[PDB]
Design a protein around this ligand. Structure first.
Ligand code: HPA
Ligand code: HPA
Lengths: 339, 339
DNA sequence: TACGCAAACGTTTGCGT
DNA sequence: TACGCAAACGTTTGCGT
């Protein structure tokens, strides 16, 4: 169970055992064999803890997420894991739930577990967080959900959420719409505010005013979707189309209309944002802006690995791009032909 | 950065530094202080690798899942993580994708990373797997998705899937139905076969024959849901109700009916199985058998921790129970009153 | 040419006194 | 009464010869 024990059966030095276990130097066949034999009977499993102590790296990665259930989230993480595996890494998944303490806790356990690098996905970034995060500038780390490039000590990957909001708005416009509504994700977030402003910009350009009774805040959870949509058509004058800050919340919105007996999109058009795996199977097939979730994983990993192996020190940042998916939840507005 | 470096600033022994860092023995205030001061400036972070080497435990847990995206799955895992965190543990998430090699790979990396215990969720359990899994009887481990209690070296937690299938079938019956259909998950699985037989039993009791054209296999993915439902009503004689082996696939089924212009449930009743967080927001609100996902996590953790701390050796097994949730996707059948 | 010896990486802990 | 010394846990590796 210990290298020595193997070395004994082998009738060889522990150095030899190491060497053949790692092809780190030439070893006589006859020798290599004996070691293996030993390694087999003794049913040895080289301790990575041992190794990690000497070589100075755990070959493990720590992802400090916000939540692992939410479809959006769930998708990215499964990608990141894909990468770790294929590249030799081990993933340590941690969810802070946007809890400062919880954050500082997980952050600390990881430093102690000595992770080669950190993948951050905290959603909101108040200074107090930006602070502890700094405190760990030593661990190589890339944040995947910043709007811009918040800190100067980590890599970023920008989703261009705004350009997505803008994309969503345009469509709606070029479809015949002028009385639109919007349910955005928590403003304390990129995917919240960012997607929204991108949208409010196409609006300004269109010369469209979004009456505030038509703007109800969500939290990326189907219920809020439900409750907001409810609050939008629960009014005397209601929009003809609505842009939903995220698909799960969209799904929330879809329900309420059905329960209010409104037809989507015959009565109301809905445009979501995320394009999660189940979206097409929404009823009706949800039209939405698709965020490259996979490349967001791989691209994050990749930058980290860089800093890791090539011991990079300067902070990078890489952009990705959302692309409009067209489905069946949007219908022509009152102004299509008048364009 | 090393205990010694702290001990120096402190003007004390590394043993003292350890002792105050762990309240493992009394230390003069004045002393305790100095250490902390040092610990602070030096910005020390005790290596858990160091520690793990001496004390013989990593205080980390390894979950060998099948997939982390699928709603069902995603839910359990987020629970398991919840537990690890609150109980001091670190989670290493691994997805084998039902790939033998991939399995044997992750299994091995974990043994090497020396995890205090293993949480298994492989879905299918062919002998070749049951074999390598055995090979690691040394690591304390509990499998969370066995039908019965397959192996004699791990703990089990039984979901009673059958009793769930049976529950699903009964309802449908007691609702007026007699021409029912079924789309079950891959038979190589508990949640597949198990849920199904439980269902086929209420049928036998009801004296109901399920014509095989009305039995189409799914894979727990919305698409199969879609394609099966499609194949069920795409026939001359179609059931009046259908039991869907799992909610995501249900969601698949819901779409197709809509696209085929059939009304759920006015034209067709659907009963799912899983009761995942979004289910209520399905359109219409999906009626289904709910599987206690959380308790499935906590209960798994808990057993493992037992074996862990209380060094248990005998294999346990604990049952959980599915409970019918009633929603809006089921309507009375032709025989309600005739009962 | 093929291998072995000892030091070492960062801790915790047994015995001290 | 409060603390320190050295051994040790499982490896990898520098120099050998
Ligand atoms: O912050 C978020 N949470 C959940 N889903 C999301 N989709 C986009 N942003 C988010
Ligand atoms: O094996 C499964 N996979 C995905 N979802 C599921 N829900 C129940 N069983 C399963």
């Amino acid at each position: 169970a210990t290298i020595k024990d193997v070395a004994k059966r082998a009738n060889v030095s522990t150095t030899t055992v190491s060497h053949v276990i790692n092809k780190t130097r030439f070893v006589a066949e006859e020798t290599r064999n004996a070691v293996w034999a030993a390694i087999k009977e003794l049913h040895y499993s080289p301790s990575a803890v041992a190794r990690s102590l000497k070589v100075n790296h755990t070959k493990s990665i720590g992802l400090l997420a916000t939540s692992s259930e939410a479809a959006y989230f769930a998708e990215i993480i499964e990608a990141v894991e894909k990468n770790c595996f294929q590249k030799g890494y081990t993933l340590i998944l941690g969810n802070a739930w946007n809890n400062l303490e919880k954050q500082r806790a997980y952050l600390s356990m990881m430093a102690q577990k000595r992770v080669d690098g950190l993948l951050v996905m905290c959603s909101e970034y108040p200074e107090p967080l930006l602070a502890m995060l700094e405190e760990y500038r030593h661990i190589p780390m890339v944040v995947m959900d910043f709007g811009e490039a918040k800190a100067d000590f980590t890599d970023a990957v920008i989703d261009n959420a705004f350009e997505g909001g803008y994309m969503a708005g345009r469509y709606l416009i070029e479809r015949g719409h002028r009385e639109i509504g919007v349910i955005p994700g928590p403003l304390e977030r990129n995917t919240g505010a960012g997607r929204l402003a991108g949208f409010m910009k196409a609006m300004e350009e269109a010369m469209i005013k979004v009456p505030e009774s038509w703007i109800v805040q969500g939290d990326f959870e189907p219920e809020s979707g439900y409750r907001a949509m409810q609050q939008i058509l629960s009014q005397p004058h209601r929009p003809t189309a609505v842009f939903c800050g995220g698909d799960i919340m969209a799904m929330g919105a879809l329900c309420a209309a059905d329960e209010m007996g409104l037809r989507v999109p015959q009565d109301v058009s809905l445009i979501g944002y995320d394009n999660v795996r189940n979206a097409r199977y929404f009823t009706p097939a949800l039209t939405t802006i698709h965020q490259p979730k996979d490349s967001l994983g791989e691209t994050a990993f990749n930058m980290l690995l860089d800093r890791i192996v090539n011991k990079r020190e300067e902070p990078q940042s890489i952009e990705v791009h959302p692309r409009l998916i067209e489905r069946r939840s949007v219908a022509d507005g009152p102004f299509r032909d008048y364009r």
